[PDB]
Design an enzyme around this catalytic site. Structure first.
Site, mmCIF file in Angstrom:
data_model
loop_
_atom_site.group_PDB
_atom_site.id
_atom_site.type_symbol
_atom_site.label_atom_id
_atom_site.label_comp_id
_atom_site.label_asym_id
_atom_site.label_seq_id
_atom_site.Cartn_x
_atom_site.Cartn_y
_atom_site.Cartn_z
ATOM 1 N N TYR A 46 0.805 -1.241 0.000
ATOM 2 C CA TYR A 46 0.000 0.000 0.000
ATOM 3 C C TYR A 46 0.833 1.283 0.000
ATOM 4 O O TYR A 46 2.018 1.222 0.330
ATOM 5 C CB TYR A 46 -0.917 0.076 1.226
ATOM 6 C CG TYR A 46 -0.246 0.333 2.552
ATOM 7 C CD1 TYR A 46 0.221 -0.714 3.328
ATOM 8 C CD2 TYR A 46 -0.100 1.617 3.046
ATOM 9 C CE1 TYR A 46 0.835 -0.492 4.547
ATOM 10 C CE2 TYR A 46 0.514 1.859 4.263
ATOM 11 C CZ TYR A 46 0.982 0.800 5.018
ATOM 12 O OH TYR A 46 1.588 1.024 6.225
ATOM 13 N N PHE A 56 2.396 9.866 3.622
ATOM 14 C CA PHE A 56 2.568 9.731 5.088
ATOM 15 C C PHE A 56 3.066 8.328 5.457
ATOM 16 O O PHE A 56 3.642 8.188 6.541
ATOM 17 C CB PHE A 56 1.282 10.122 5.818
ATOM 18 C CG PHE A 56 0.033 9.377 5.421
ATOM 19 C CD1 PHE A 56 -0.171 8.065 5.817
ATOM 20 C CD2 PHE A 56 -0.955 9.998 4.677
ATOM 21 C CE1 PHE A 56 -1.325 7.389 5.458
ATOM 22 C CE2 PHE A 56 -2.110 9.323 4.325
ATOM 23 C CZ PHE A 56 -2.293 8.019 4.715
ATOM 24 N N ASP A 57 2.877 7.345 4.564
ATOM 25 C CA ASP A 57 3.346 5.952 4.830
ATOM 26 C C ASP A 57 3.281 5.076 3.574
ATOM 27 O O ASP A 57 2.556 5.450 2.648
ATOM 28 C CB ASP A 57 2.593 5.306 6.005
ATOM 29 C CG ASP A 57 3.339 4.164 6.671
ATOM 30 O OD1 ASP A 57 4.561 4.065 6.471
ATOM 31 O OD2 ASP A 57 2.690 3.380 7.380
ATOM 32 N N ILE A 76 -8.392 1.053 10.258
ATOM 33 C CA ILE A 76 -9.432 2.105 10.073
ATOM 34 C C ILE A 76 -10.654 1.513 9.353
ATOM 35 O O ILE A 76 -10.478 0.593 8.563
ATOM 36 C CB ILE A 76 -8.850 3.342 9.354
ATOM 37 C CG1 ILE A 76 -8.254 3.014 7.983
ATOM 38 C CG2 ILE A 76 -7.848 4.057 10.248
ATOM 39 C CD1 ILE A 76 -7.752 4.229 7.245
ATOM 40 N N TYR A 102 -9.132 8.617 10.698
ATOM 41 C CA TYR A 102 -8.627 8.934 12.065
ATOM 42 C C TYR A 102 -9.430 10.080 12.691
ATOM 43 O O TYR A 102 -9.084 10.494 13.801
ATOM 44 C CB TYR A 102 -7.125 9.215 12.016
ATOM 45 C CG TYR A 102 -6.295 7.980 11.789
ATOM 46 C CD1 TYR A 102 -6.163 7.022 12.778
ATOM 47 C CD2 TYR A 102 -5.665 7.756 10.578
ATOM 48 C CE1 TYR A 102 -5.412 5.878 12.579
ATOM 49 C CE2 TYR A 102 -4.913 6.618 10.361
ATOM 50 C CZ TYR A 102 -4.786 5.675 11.363
ATOM 51 O OH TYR A 102 -4.043 4.543 11.156
ATOM 52 N N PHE A 119 -5.576 6.159 -0.518
ATOM 53 C CA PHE A 119 -4.646 5.011 -0.514
ATOM 54 C C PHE A 119 -4.752 4.200 -1.806
ATOM 55 O O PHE A 119 -5.856 4.116 -2.345
ATOM 56 C CB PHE A 119 -4.983 4.022 0.602
ATOM 57 C CG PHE A 119 -4.730 4.434 2.031
ATOM 58 C CD1 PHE A 119 -5.671 5.160 2.740
ATOM 59 C CD2 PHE A 119 -3.580 4.032 2.694
ATOM 60 C CE1 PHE A 119 -5.453 5.508 4.063
ATOM 61 C CE2 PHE A 119 -3.362 4.382 4.017
ATOM 62 C CZ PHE A 119 -4.299 5.119 4.699
HETATM 63 O O1 LIG Z 1 -4.238 2.653 13.152
HETATM 64 C C1 LIG Z 1 -4.351 1.443 12.976
HETATM 65 N N1 LIG Z 1 -5.221 0.697 13.654
HETATM 66 C C2 LIG Z 1 -5.969 1.216 14.788
HETATM 67 C C3 LIG Z 1 -7.389 1.604 14.456
HETATM 68 C C4 LIG Z 1 -8.419 0.691 14.471
HETATM 69 C C5 LIG Z 1 -9.700 1.096 14.172
HETATM 70 C C6 LIG Z 1 -9.916 2.407 13.857
HETATM 71 N N2 LIG Z 1 -8.943 3.317 13.830
HETATM 72 C C7 LIG Z 1 -7.707 2.899 14.131
HETATM 73 C C8 LIG Z 1 -3.491 0.729 11.937
HETATM 74 C C9 LIG Z 1 -2.181 0.236 12.565
HETATM 75 C C10 LIG Z 1 -1.014 1.185 12.458
HETATM 76 C C11 LIG Z 1 -0.926 2.306 13.274
HETATM 77 C C12 LIG Z 1 0.146 3.179 13.187
HETATM 78 C C13 LIG Z 1 1.125 2.910 12.280
HETATM 79 F F1 LIG Z 1 2.177 3.764 12.190
HETATM 80 C C14 LIG Z 1 1.094 1.822 11.457
HETATM 81 C C15 LIG Z 1 0.016 0.956 11.556
HETATM 82 N N3 LIG Z 1 -3.263 1.559 10.766
HETATM 83 C C16 LIG Z 1 -4.212 1.753 9.839
HETATM 84 O O2 LIG Z 1 -5.386 1.447 10.048
HETATM 85 C C17 LIG Z 1 -3.795 2.383 8.492
HETATM 86 C C18 LIG Z 1 -4.377 1.600 7.325
HETATM 87 C C19 LIG Z 1 -3.598 0.311 7.107
HETATM 88 C C20 LIG Z 1 -2.130 0.608 6.867
HETATM 89 C C21 LIG Z 1 -1.547 1.415 8.012
HETATM 90 N N4 LIG Z 1 -2.362 2.612 8.247
HETATM 91 S S1 LIG Z 1 -1.757 4.093 8.167
HETATM 92 O O3 LIG Z 1 -0.714 4.099 7.184
HETATM 93 O O4 LIG Z 1 -2.836 5.029 8.071
HETATM 94 C C22 LIG Z 1 -0.978 4.391 9.748
HETATM 95 C C23 LIG Z 1 -0.169 5.653 9.753
HETATM 96 C C24 LIG Z 1 -0.747 6.863 10.088
HETATM 97 C C25 LIG Z 1 -0.003 8.033 10.106
HETATM 98 C C26 LIG Z 1 1.316 7.962 9.776
HETATM 99 F F2 LIG Z 1 2.051 9.104 9.788
HETATM 100 C C27 LIG Z 1 1.931 6.793 9.440
HETATM 101 C C28 LIG Z 1 1.174 5.632 9.430
#
Ligand SMILES: O=C(NCc1cccnc1)[C@H](Cc1ccc(F)cc1)NC(=O)[C@@H]1CCCCN1S(=O)(=O)Cc1ccc(F)cc1
Length: 126
Positions: A46, A56-57, A76, A102, A119
């Site tokens: 991704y 951002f990632d 998410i 978020y 994405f």
């Molecule tokens: O947050 C998460 N789950 C908790 C949750 C559950 C339910 C509802 N809400 C939240 C996961 C797990 C994660 C957190 C933090 C990280 F650094 C890496 C992974 N992430 C994601 O869901 C998304 C989507 C899938 C790929 C990863 N990203 S992402 O790229 O956006 C993260 C990012 C955000 C900002 C940045 F600057 C860099 C990275």
């Protein structure tokens, strides 16, 4: 008895789907393999961006891929909904509204409050 009609599979080119949640997606490439369904452990590559183009990632080489239990709340809401129905080999672009991302909390001080996220996701395994 209800039968499936495969409209989104047959006419996917240039097509932007808007769902009842407000999520939008477009299949850039249609996959040839198995379909992603809730309950499965899925693996993907991704890249994520803000609407203005700031990345951002990404699923960078390292030892990836990224894997999660579909429908299980590990990610998410736009991902739990958006990845369902992809087929192995497919690339799908997700445009996620803040309520399915978020929200007002943002993430890490890199993604701001109330941000729309874009994405591009590639499905590798189901
Ligand atoms: O947050 C998460 N789950 C908790 C949750 C559950 C339910 C509802 N809400 C939240 C996961 C797990 C994660 C957190 C933090 C990280 F650094 C890496 C992974 N992430 C994601 O869901 C998304 C989507 C899938 C790929 C990863 N990203 S992402 O790229 O956006 C993260 C990012 C955000 C900002 C940045 F600057 C860099 C990275």
């Amino acid at each position: 008895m209800h039968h499936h009609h495969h409209h989104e599979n047959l006419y996917f080119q240039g097509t932007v789907v808007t769902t009842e949640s407000g999520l939008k997606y477009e299949d850039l490439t249609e996959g040839s393999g198995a379909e992603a369904r809730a309950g499965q452990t899925v693996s993907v590559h991704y890249t994520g961006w803000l609407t203005d183009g700031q990345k951002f990632d990404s699923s960078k080489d390292r030892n990836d891929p990224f894997a999660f239990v579909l429908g299980g709340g590990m990610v998410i809401k736009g991902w739990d909904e958006g990845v369902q129905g992809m087929k192995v080999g497919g690339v799908r672009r997700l445009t996620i509204p803040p309520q399915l991302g978020y929200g007002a909390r943002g993430a890490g001080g890199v993604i701001p409050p109330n941000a729309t996220l874009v994405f591009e996701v590639e499905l590798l395994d189901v």
